[PDB]
Design a protein around this ligand. Structure first.
Ligand SMILES: *[C@@H]1O[C@H](CO)[C@@H](O[C@@H]2O[C@H](CO)[C@@H](O[C@@H]3O[C@H](CO[C@H]4O[C@H](CO)[C@@H](O)[C@H](O[C@H]5O[C@H](CO)[C@@H](O)[C@H](O)[C@@H]5O)[C@@H]4O)[C@@H](O)[C@H](O[C@H]4O[C@H](CO)[C@@H](O)[C@H](O)[C@@H]4O[C@@H]4O[C@H](CO)[C@@H](O)[C@H](O)[C@H]4NC(C)=O)[C@@H]3O)[C@H](O)[C@H]2NC(C)=O)[C@H](O)[C@H]1NC(C)=O
Ligand SMILES: *[C@@H]1O[C@H](CO)[C@@H](O[C@@H]2O[C@H](CO)[C@@H](O[C@@H]3O[C@H](CO[C@H]4O[C@H](CO)[C@@H](O)[C@H](O[C@H]5O[C@H](CO)[C@@H](O)[C@H](O)[C@@H]5O)[C@@H]4O)[C@@H](O)[C@H](O[C@H]4O[C@H](CO)[C@@H](O)[C@H](O)[C@@H]4O)[C@@H]3O)[C@H](O)[C@H]2NC(C)=O)[C@H](O)[C@H]1NC(C)=O
Ligand SMILES: *[C@@H]1O[C@H](CO)[C@@H](O[C@@H]2O[C@H](CO)[C@@H](O[C@@H]3O[C@H](CO[C@H]4O[C@H](CO)[C@@H](O)[C@H](O[C@H]5O[C@H](CO)[C@@H](O)[C@H](O)[C@@H]5O)[C@@H]4O)[C@@H](O)[C@H](O[C@H]4O[C@H](CO)[C@@H](O)[C@H](O)[C@@H]4O)[C@@H]3O)[C@H](O)[C@H]2NC(C)=O)[C@H](O)[C@H]1NC(C)=O
Ligand SMILES: *[C@@H]1O[C@H](CO)[C@@H](O[C@@H]2O[C@H](CO)[C@@H](O[C@@H]3O[C@H](CO[C@H]4O[C@H](CO)[C@@H](O)[C@H](O)[C@@H]4O)[C@@H](O)[C@H](O)[C@@H]3O)[C@H](O)[C@H]2NC(C)=O)[C@H](O)[C@H]1NC(C)=O
Ligand SMILES: *[C@@H]1O[C@H](CO)[C@@H](O[C@@H]2O[C@H](CO)[C@@H](O[C@@H]3O[C@H](CO[C@H]4O[C@H](CO)[C@@H](O)[C@H](O)[C@@H]4O)[C@@H](O)[C@H](O)[C@@H]3O)[C@H](O)[C@H]2NC(C)=O)[C@H](O)[C@H]1NC(C)=O
Ligand SMILES: *[C@@H]1O[C@H](CO)[C@@H](O[C@@H]2O[C@H](CO)[C@@H](O)[C@H](O)[C@H]2NC(C)=O)[C@H](O)[C@H]1NC(C)=O
Ligand SMILES: CC(=O)OCC[N+](C)(C)C
Ligand SMILES: CC(=O)OCC[N+](C)(C)C
Lengths: 49, 163, 350, 343, 322, 323
């Protein structure tokens, strides 16, 4: 029973931990400040009048 | 402005000139002489917008505003070293319970100690974060999952000892 | 018509509170100072702030406010807002929260003959270095430094108030109708000294300030009950692990480690109650550290023995002797740390 | 802007902001009080205090500030610093920190007919009786009482602010397009009521019925307690020969006690009622103490009898705990906030 | 509002707020002082400070502020800024860390007879000698000594509005119940000013704590641990867990003593009954551990006797304490 | 008996506190700035804020506030409110949560030569980058950038009174010792104002922490718990205390790590050395527990020797680094 519980819980624990940590690490801010607006609002992208 | 409205004052972004051509300064100004790098937050974007609400009355104060945005990203290395690593190690320590012999009489003790450590970490993180119900923090979800797994492992160990 | 209005108009129609009450610029204004302590609000060792409530009796002669009762229908005292008269601008120099002045701008009392009296109440938080060496049986030499924020010693000069018997009150005054005893800190002495110094290295204008030395004493009884006794019991319980069997089932190491954890919790409590200053270590903290070291050595000895009964007994006797000697030596310094005998009169009259 | 300066000087020539604009000696001043909630900053159970950021909407008629725009270059409205006109001293009576007045005296808007409108921002910390019972599924009914501090009901008559169409929209105004949503509390009902005097004063009471979002406390508090209770129940399944039953029981009891001590700081210190979660925690602690006592008795007791007593205690404690927890949870969940703000 | 504007302009044209509002300097300004208690904000036993929300209804006649109503269309009362007029300088003698005097200068109700009623709000953080002996079932007698600071009894006389504080608007606190309240006038003489006694009004309130919160969150767990303390003497030595239980109970008692120390002032005036019970329980735990160690180093009969003795002593101590 | 009132009336009859106190507008106001540090009130590492009690002595000659002493009976100095005169608008650039400018407007001392000395008190809550690496034996270099906010260097020039801050009245702090102090004047160009460089005086203080309190309350328990780890390998398996002792050591180390992380700011610029040591000890304890479980299921002496040698080497390296 101990070995069965190991073989059941250990991979589940590892998969859950890895999933949580990968979902956390992969989070990044969007490349644009406002979604749906192509303008970057950056000093190098001066929008001359 | 609260003393004035769009009928009284028109807000606009600062215009700056390069090569005799003017352009609006649509971002937060950072001056390298006056700017101090914060130790936790990196400024990824810093836009500025003049917001006008078309449905708001022209004489209401809420019609216009200038909003400067700071999209700041947390530097996680401190939290990885000090929080994430001990919590993950303590969670994975529960997997060793299945390996300790039943004659040792310490499997339940190990499981309960792991549960207590997880509870202490959850208390610390819940103290470090606001009580917002919008979403469970990722580390909080991991802690809850680990606590559930530790409870199940304690039940399994108790059953094994009974057998 | 009210005679007080005539007196006020007569005194203040041509009065300038900016200039000092001196006929010549080189004259000094003599100030009579009498700090009356109402209660010692608290002594925060962690923040090193002494909070006290005082009444600052300040008396001086202002020839511009001189009047006789015979000319104004027998008025002997006039209450005037303090913003209207010249003030010596006495401030607590060694404060810590930035509140130099008094808490309430009470009216000044202009008596006949030109004597002006001000008795404002003030709550003061001041820097008092805390000597935690002999805690909880410690006594603290807090000090209050009063000086003019504006004028030097050649413009404003301090003197102590004189009692009805002619004796100078060269100490903090305590009034039985106002003083409320603090339940944690007793007050032993409160002498006052008017210090004078030179200014710049080129013999600049003199400086003068009044320093009151509140020599106060901690009432240790509470800390005896709730801190000392638990720590002593915990340290005593350390020695019991040796009588536990040196075979399977003997929880000697477990007991030792649990007592060490309890002593660590007590150390955390002491560190919370005692400031982070590193000038000295509290003798109770030193005793706690010594007991923790002894407990670690006892754990080591138990591990060695388990890896026996005679060795357990001999280590029990050795550890008991060492612990007793250490506890006695630690507590002797605290017990001997009485307030020293000093020439000052007691602050609270028997 | 010559005409504006001339009109302002005309209006304030001989004006006195300390005198209320009663025309006749018996005339009352009617002040419409509306409230716009910009942010529900927080609710503190320990202090029983709700902190909110609001914009008032005070409207009254000051006959002294009326003018004909046709004589003054068509100026039909004017913005004037609030300190220069008479203001009703509307204050938050039930504030908890002594800050009666508004946070910033922004300018009022005066219409040519003498209608003065003022929308000052205020940061307010009102006292709010916390419903401690149904934590964390509890709903709170906080009140903001606005009244003139000095003037009697015979001098200033308060009224609830009407809707933009003139409807009796006796509600706290919330612009859903800009309102700063609170992360823990959801506003359900937001009515307002004018309260008549029982020299007495009228009051305008604004009601915030905010429901606690329980997910945070479900995850961080309730679930650990349930797990600890389950472990304390399963303690009775550990055989005596393992020698770990007393350890597990003591650790479970200590963890439950620590959770109780932590929750005691979350719940208010008032003792008018016991939170249902606190009652559950106390029942669980009593159960764990009885379990420890029965384990000690079983150890003192022979082995077959001890095992039979252990199993009997296990079944009885399981039944009692399940029944108590189910009843408590049903009672806590059933008491939803009412659909009517005045039941 | 023209009548009231003219009246206000004429009253304060040459008004002086410095001198007292008497016709003759030999007269005494008689001020009626009524303390209204709106809310008992906080009681801090640790700092020995009581924070209360109050209104100070002060009423007095100003000789110069009379007017004839028929001159002003029948205006019989007006509201004026209180900074304009002379006011008694009521100071809270026992201020701990707040303001001594009033700081919210709300409007004054002035009537044509000259009668001024001023009801400023205040938050008073008064010093109170917290008696911790019977905590949490204790009752606290807390007072507020209010009086004119610079004016003595021969110059300004203050009289209580009623023998009891006005509790009509009192927001009933959920932790403390006011058993009784009363206001006493006193005429004490200070060493500063021996020729002239100074009058004060000392309001006092006998508050009583509602112990349910402290019973549930403090007393019950400590009682449970004290009950479990004696249980160790029934567990046989062969279990090998008597010391683990005794030390876990000791640790729990240490934690709760730490909590209680944070809940009570560190003043050495008297030991709390709960503090005394906790110290007794700690001594009993130490003695029980010593005796258990001696027994480990006949055993069943001693265990039974010690279990009975511990249970009886626990019940006796609980009865004598509660 | 009235000459000082006459003098004060004559000086300020048509005085303007808006214009600079120079005879010609093309001249530069020379201000001498001396920071006197009265007390180092606090150094909050977690908030990275240093709170200091200072007297900010400023000395300058006001061209219009001269008088002839013989006109006023030999009066050579007067005290006047600072709100009446023109003042340099010294702002603390690195303010964290305090006031930018002086708010305690004490009286200034004016002399017949026009020399004004103003010594306002201030409680500066300045920003300081707290270095956590060598904690609790760290030396912190905290600075105060003080300068005229609106007046540029060609208009109002500030000069330091002395190369070092005035520590003559410094109340010795019980936690930090000022090992060094120095003031440097700088001119820098900001993007707001490209044609006019602005002057500032950056005072800096190299303060060394006194570690004794942290040694007693933190370092010693951590060292004791680390030492207790190695005993598990000498303790026999038949005792049954191996696992309980290892779990207790792990829990104590976790609690001490939480205490340390609470005592240290969450800035991610650099890792602390004590925190790194605690993490290494945690990893070592985890490995030791794993190996103990392997042994129990199934070495003890070899692991004990290896752990003792490695621990002694690490302790010697840590002691050398902290010294
Ligand atoms: C950080 O936080 C800040 C805020 O704190 C974030 O800033 C917000 O960013 C969002 C995302 O872009 C913005 O939302 C968009 O706003 C624009 C602008 O519209 C405004 O101005 C218009 C006139 O200029 C006016 O018509 C708009 O009114 C609309 O919205 C109001 C409010 O709901 C309604 O009452 C009106 O009836 C009307 O709908 C408004 O004042 C909008 O264009 C944009 O709308 C698009 O997206 C919506 C949902 O995504 C759809 O419902 C809309 O139909 C519309 O759809 C879009 O239409 C485009 C035109 O054809 C098309 O190109 C596009 O593909 C299409 N998109 C989709 C998905 O169908 C939307 O509402 C918000 O205003 C910002 N807030 C500010 C600036 O204060 C910021 O993003 C954050 N940064 C991060 C996360 O990195
Ligand atoms: C809670 O704590 C508060 C204080 O914080 C307690 O309040 C005290 O209550 C007692 C009664 O319970 C009060 O005593 C009463 O005082 C009044 C006023 O007395 C003053 O004025 C008198 C007028 O001239 C004067 O005679 C008084 O002088 C007395 O006192 C001095 C010393 O102070 C003494 O030397 C004198 O000989 C006098 O005795 C004083 O200036 C007084 O009118 C009352 O008289 C009652 O009692 C007498 C007999 O004692 C009786 O003949 C009368 O008919 C009447 O019944 C009485 O003395 C006291 O003043 C309050 N003190 C304060 C500071 O408020 C409160 O009792 C506590 N309650 C609890 C439940 O713990
Ligand atoms: C703690 O932290 C503080 C700051 O937080 C440190 O303070 C700095 O200390 C160093 C020395 O240790 C200072 O450097 C000195 O600065 C002065 C003043 O220089 C200014 O004025 C000059 C006069 O015109 C000017 O030339 C300077 O211009 C410099 O900068 C520009 C652009 O940045 C550059 O183009 C120039 O080339 C210059 O570098 C500047 O405006 C200066 O007089 C000193 O020169 C001495 O030393 C150098 C060699 O070091 C030598 O060549 C010279 O002959 C002379 O002997 C020197 O540069 C620095 O200004 C301080 N900065 C601040 C902000 O206070 C402090 O040192 C730290 N202590 C520690 C870690 O212990
Ligand atoms: C409580 O605290 C008080 C304040 O710290 C203590 O008073 C001070 O105690 C110190 C002890 O070192 C004295 O310092 C000594 O003073 C003498 C006298 O010289 C004085 O005069 C000269 C010339 O003006 C001046 O240079 C000195 O500084 C002194 O003012 C010197 O001979 C010694 O070298 C040494 O400096 C202080 O003088 C003394 N000050 C006062 C105002 O009392 C007090 O002793 C403490 N008491 C207790 C019981 O702890
Ligand atoms: C949130 O709390 C509010 C108070 O803090 C609640 O408002 C209360 O709602 C109840 C239920 O309707 C009201 O009670 C009723 O009151 C009326 C009016 O009473 C007055 O007049 C009668 C004479 O007719 C007189 O006897 C009373 O003394 C009053 O002068 C009565 O007619 C009803 O019988 C009944 O008592 C409260 O009055 C009302 N209080 C306030 C201040 O408005 C509110 O309902 C709460 N919300 C929720 C969701 O619980
Ligand atoms: C203060 O004023 C009093 C009152 O004028 C002065 O005392 C004497 O008053 C009488 C009035 O009858 C005068 O004739 C005397 O000339 C006054 N002087 C003396 C010395 O008797 C008093 O001198 C004034 N000065 C002070 C310092 O008290
Ligand atoms: C005259 C004066 O200021 O008296 C204040 C002190 N008091 C009121 C305690 C006697
Ligand atoms: C002109 C002005 O206000 O400059 C302030 C900004 N500074 C001092 C960084 C250049």
């Amino acid at each position: 029973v101990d070995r069965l519980c190991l073989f059941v819980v250990t991979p589940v624990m590892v998969v859950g931990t890895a999933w949580i940590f990968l979902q956390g690490v992969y989070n990044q801010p969007p490349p644009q400040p406002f979604p749906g607006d192509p303008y970057s609002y950056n000093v190098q992208d001066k929008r001359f009048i | 402005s609260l003393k004035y409205t769009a009928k009284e004052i028109t807000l606009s972004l600062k215009q700056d000139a390069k090569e005799n051509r003017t352009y609006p300064v649509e971002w937060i100004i950072i001056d390298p002489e006056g700017f101090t790098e914060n130790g936790e937050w990196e400024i990824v974007h810093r836009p500025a917008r003049v917001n006008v609400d078309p449905r708001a009355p022209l004489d209401s104060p809420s019609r216009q505003d200038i909003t400067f945005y700071l999209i700041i990203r947390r530097k996680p290395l401190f939290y990885i070293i000090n929080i994430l690593v001990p919590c993950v190690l303590i969670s994975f320590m529960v997997n060793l319970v299945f390996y300790l012999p039943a004659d040792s009489g310490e499997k339940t003790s190990v499981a309960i100690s792991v549960l207590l450590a997880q509870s202490v970490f959850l208390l610390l993180i819940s103290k470090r974060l606001p009580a917002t119900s919008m979403a469970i923090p990722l580390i909080g979800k991991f802690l809850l999952f680990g606590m559930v797994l530790v409870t199940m492992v304690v039940v399994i160990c108790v059953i094994v000892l009974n057998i | 018509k009210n005679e007080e209005l005539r007196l006020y108009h007569h005194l203040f129609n041509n009065y300038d509170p900016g200039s000092r009450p001196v006929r010549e610029p080189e004259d000094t204004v003599t100030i009579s100072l009498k700090v009356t302590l109402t209660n010692l609000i608290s002594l925060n060792e962690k923040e090193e702030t002494l909070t006290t409530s005082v009444w600052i009796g300040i008396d001086w002669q202002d020839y511009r406010l001189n009047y006789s009762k015979d000319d104004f229908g027998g008025i002997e005292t006039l209450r005037v807002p303090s913003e209207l008269v010249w003030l010596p601008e006495i401030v607590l120099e060694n404060n810590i929260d930035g509140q130099f002045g008094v808490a309430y701008d009470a009216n000044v009392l202009v008596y006949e003959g030109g004597s002006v009296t001000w008795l404002p109440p003030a709550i003061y938080r001041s820097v008092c270095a805390v000597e935690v060496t002999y805690f909880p049986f410690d006594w603290q030499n807090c000090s209050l430094i009063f000086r003019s924020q504006t004028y030097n010693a050649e413009e404003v000069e301090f003197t102590f108030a004189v009692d009805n018997d002619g004796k100078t009150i060269n100490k903090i005054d305590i009034d039985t109708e106002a003083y409320t005893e603090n339940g944690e800190w007793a007050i032993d002495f409160c002498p006052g000294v008017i210090r004078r110094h030179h200014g710049g290295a080129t013999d600049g204008p003199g400086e003068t300030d009044v320093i009151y030395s509140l020599i106060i004493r901690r009432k240790p009884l509470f800390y005896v009950i709730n801190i000392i006794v638990p720590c002593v019991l915990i340290s005593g319980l350390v020695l019991l692990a040796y009588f536990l069997p040196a075979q399977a089932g003997g929880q000697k190491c477990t007991v030792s480690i649990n007592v060490l954890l309890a002593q660590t919790v007590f150390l955390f409590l002491i560190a919370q109650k005692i400031p982070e200053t590193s000038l000295s270590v509290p003798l109770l903290g030193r005793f706690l550290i010594f007991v923790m070291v002894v407990a670690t050595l006892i754990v080591m000895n138990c591990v060695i023995v388990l890896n026996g009964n005679a060795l357990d007994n001999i280590c029990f006797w050795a550890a008991l002797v060492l612990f007793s000697v250490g506890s006695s030596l630690i507590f002797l310094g605290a017990y001997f740390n009485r307030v020293p005998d000093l020439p000052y009169a007691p602050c609270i009259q028997p | 802007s010559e005409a504006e300066g001339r009109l302002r000087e005309k209006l304030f020539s001989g004006y006195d902001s300390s005198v209320r604009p009663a025309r006749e000696v018996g005339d009352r001043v009617r002040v419409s009080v509306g409230l716009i909630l910009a942010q529900l900053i927080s609710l503190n159970e320990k202090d029983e205090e709700m902190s909110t950021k609001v914009y008032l909407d005070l409207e009254w008629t000051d006959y002294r500030l009326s003018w004909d725009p046709a004589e003054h270059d068509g100026i039909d409205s004017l913005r004037i610093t609030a300190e220069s006109v008479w203001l009703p001293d509307v204050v938050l009576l039930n504030n908890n920190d002594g800050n009666f007045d508004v946070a910033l005296d922004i300018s009022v808007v005066v219409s040519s007919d003498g209608s003065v409108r003022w929308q000052p921002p205020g940061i307010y910390r009102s006292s709010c009786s916390i419903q401690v019972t149904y934590f964390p599924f509890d709903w709170q009914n906080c009140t903001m009482v606005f009244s003139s501090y000095s003037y009697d009901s015979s001098e200033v008559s308060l009224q609830t602010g009407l809707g933009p169409d003139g409807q009796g929209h006796q509600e706290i105004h919330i612009h859903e397009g800009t309102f700063i949503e609170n992360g823990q509390w959801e506003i359900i009902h937001k009515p307002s009521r004018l309260i008549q005097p029982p020299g007495q004063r009228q009051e305008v009471i604004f009601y915030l019925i905010i429901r606690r979002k329980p997910l945070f406390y479900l995850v961080n508090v309730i679930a650990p307690c349930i797990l600890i209770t389950l472990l304390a129940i399963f303690v009775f399944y550990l055989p005596p020969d393992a020698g770990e039953k007393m350890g597990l029981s003591i650790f479970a009891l200590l963890t439950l006690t620590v959770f109780l001590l932590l929750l005691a700081d979350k719940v208010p210190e008032t003792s008018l009622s016991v939170p249902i979660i606190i009652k559950y925690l106390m029942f669980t602690m009593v159960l764990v103490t009885f379990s420890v006592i029965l384990s000690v008795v079983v150890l003192n007791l022979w082995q077959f009898v001890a095992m039979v007593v252990d199993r009997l205690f296990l079944w009885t404690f399981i039944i009692f705990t399940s029944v108590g927890t189910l009843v408590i949870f049903l009672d806590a969940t059933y008491h939803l906030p009412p659909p009517d703000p005045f039941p | 509002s023209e009548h009231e504007t003219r009246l206000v302009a004429k009253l304060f044209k040459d008004y002086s707020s410095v001198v007292r509002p008497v016709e003759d300097h030999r007269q005494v300004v008689e001020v009626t002082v009524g303390l209204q208690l709106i809310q008992l904000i906080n009681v801090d036993e640790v700092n020995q400070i009581v924070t209360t929300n109050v209104r100070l209804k002060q009423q007095w006649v100003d000789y110069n502020l009379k007017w004839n109503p028929d001159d002003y269309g029948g205006v019989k009362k007006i509201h004026i800024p209180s900074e304009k007029i002379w006011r008694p300088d009521l100071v809270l003698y026992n201020n701990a860390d707040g303001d001594f005097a009033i700081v919210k200068f709300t409007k004054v109700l002035l009537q044509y007879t000259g009668h001024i009623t001023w009801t400023p709000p205040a938050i008073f953080k008064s010093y109170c000698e917290i008696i911790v002996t019977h905590f949490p079932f204790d009752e606290q007698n807390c007072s507020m000594k209010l009086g004119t600071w610079t004016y003595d009894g021969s110059v300004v006389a203050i009289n209580p509005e009623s023998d009891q504080p006005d509790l009509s608007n009192f927001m009933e606190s959920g932790e403390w119940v006011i058993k009784e309240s009363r206001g006493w006038k006193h005429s004490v003489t200070y060493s500063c000013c021996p020729d002239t006694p100074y009058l004060d009004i000392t309001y006092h309130f006998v508050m009583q704590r509602l112990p349910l919160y402290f019973i549930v969150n403090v007393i019950i767990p400590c009682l449970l641990f004290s009950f479990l303390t004696g249980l160790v003497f029934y567990l046989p030595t062969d279990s090998g867990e008597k010391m683990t239980l005794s030390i876990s109970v000791l640790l729990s008692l240490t934690v709760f003593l730490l909590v209680i120390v944070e809940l009570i002032p560190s003043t050495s005036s008297a030991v709390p009954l709960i503090g005394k019970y906790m110290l007794f329980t700690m001594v009993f735990v130490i003695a029980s551990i010593i005796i258990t160690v001696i027994v480990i180093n006949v055993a069943m009969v001693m265990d039974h006797i010690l279990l009975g003795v511990f249970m009886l002593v626990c019940i006796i101590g609980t009865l004598a304490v509660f």
